[PDB]
């Protein structure tokens, strides 16, 4: 595991919402990747990829404010601009064997409703 290398994969994944092409996401992801946000859990690359894809809809501008890399676990704070409003959420990522094993996502109360409907709509 390489600290500089680990930081790139998390940052590049986060970065490619506003920019790049959606569904580009999957290459970083391991096959059994799961994403957790609150009570909800998403399983498999497709589902996690799709989530991310769906999440981009509410992202015009994405900005990574700060990063912490501890062991194989990365913690990121990111700020997103959607139609003139700014909201901040944190992603915590565990990387195993050079591939993402698990993603845990923390979002603002206001955005919980949004997340819930992505869960239903998925």
Please say whether the beta carbons of 92 and 106 come within 8 A.
Answer: yes
In the chain, % helix, strand, coil (3-state, to 5) comes to 35, 45, 20
Please say whether the beta carbons of 14 and 64 come within 8 A.
Answer: yes
Cα–Cα distances (Å) from 11 to 4, 22, 110, in that order, read 11, 15, 24
Among candidate residues 111, 72, 77, the one with its CA nearest the CA of residue 95? 72
Question: Which residues are within 8 A (CB) of 25 and not within 5 positions of it... i.e. 6 or more apart?
Answer: 13, 16, 48, 49, 52, 53
CB atoms closer than 10 angstroms to residue 4: 7
Among candidate residues 68, 108, 71, 76, the one with its CA nearest the CA of residue 12? 76
Half-sphere exposure of 40 (CA within 13 A, CB side): 20
CA distance 22 to 20: 7
Alpha-carbon torsion 22, 28, 33, 37, what sign? Answer: negative
Please say whether the beta carbons of 76 and 89 come within 8 A.
Answer: no
Resolution of the experimental model, in Å, one decimal: 3.1
Q: How many domains does the chain have?
A: 1
- How many helices (H) and strands (E) the chain has is answered by 3, 6
- Three-class DSSP category at 6: helix
- Domain housing 31: 1-122
Question: Which residues are within 8 A (CB) of 24 and not within 5 positions of it... i.e. 6 or more apart?
Answer: 16
């Amino acid at each position: 595991m390489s600290r500089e290398e680990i930081r790139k994969v998390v940052e590049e994944m986060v970065r490619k919402l506003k920019q790049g092409s959606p569904e580009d996401i999957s290459k970083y992801l391991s096959p059994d990747v799961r994403l957790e946000v609150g009570n909800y859990t998403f399983e498999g690359s497709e589902q996690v990829t799709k989530f991310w894809r769906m999440l981009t809809k509410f992202v015009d501008r994405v900005e990574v404010r700060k990063v912490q890399v501890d062991g194989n676990h990365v913690r990121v704070e990111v700020e997103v601009e959607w139609n003139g409003k700014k909201w901040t959420f944190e992603v915590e990522v565990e990387v195993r064997n050079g591939k993402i094993k698990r993603i845990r996502l923390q979002v603002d109360p206001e955005f919980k409703k949004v997340v819930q409907n992505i869960w239903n709509l998925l």
